[PDB]
Assembly symmetry: C2
Amino acid sequence: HHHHSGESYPQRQDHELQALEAIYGADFQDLRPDACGPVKEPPEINLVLYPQGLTGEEVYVKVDLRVKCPPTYPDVVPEIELKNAKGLSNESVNLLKSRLEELAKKHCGEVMIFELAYHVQSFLSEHN
Amino acid sequence: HHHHSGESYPQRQDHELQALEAIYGADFQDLRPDACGPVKEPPEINLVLYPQGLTGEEVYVKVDLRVKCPPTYPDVVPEIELKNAKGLSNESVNLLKSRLEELAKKHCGEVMIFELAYHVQSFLSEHN
């Protein structure tokens, strides 16, 4: 009745955060403060995302992907927010948020932030 | 004229392998032998993939995702192969391979093995 990997929800979430930091690096940020105790707060991360395959150093379209993973993630959808949108209209931001929440529902059962991030990168490329 | 991350192709490929090992763990395998010299062969990995959100311990449909990344990856598509297919017909395996190579073409410019792996997991769930 448990996931085939045999890992708990915190281990699956912690492994995804390590994977996100390895690929995105400085564009990834764990917004949780350094806890002096043994309790780990639910992960809240920020991903600065650019159009797919962006080159150079001059950006025109970008947005920050704010993801808060509840304890039952990824068996439940995470809290998705879009911040610091640049070069996007209000209708395009609402559309992207609706598509991400729709993607998150179909992605339940597996960690999904990598798929949400690529969906944003592909979306930004279509509006660039 | 270079990627916005400022990282080279080997660094982007090595970061993806570290991310893949963190999430998939034992289902991920680097098929490159341990080189005693300083030259790193092109990454050739194997991903044992199951239907999305598979529970229990009894598997019915599964396949291994064989990916070989050329030096210019991800600016060029990687070599994709499907091995050890279980519960899938020959037509379904050829379809999955065609969809993965189509996905890889649209994903050029960013690392894509995570998107290829989820596409397989979602595909296996539709044939389960």
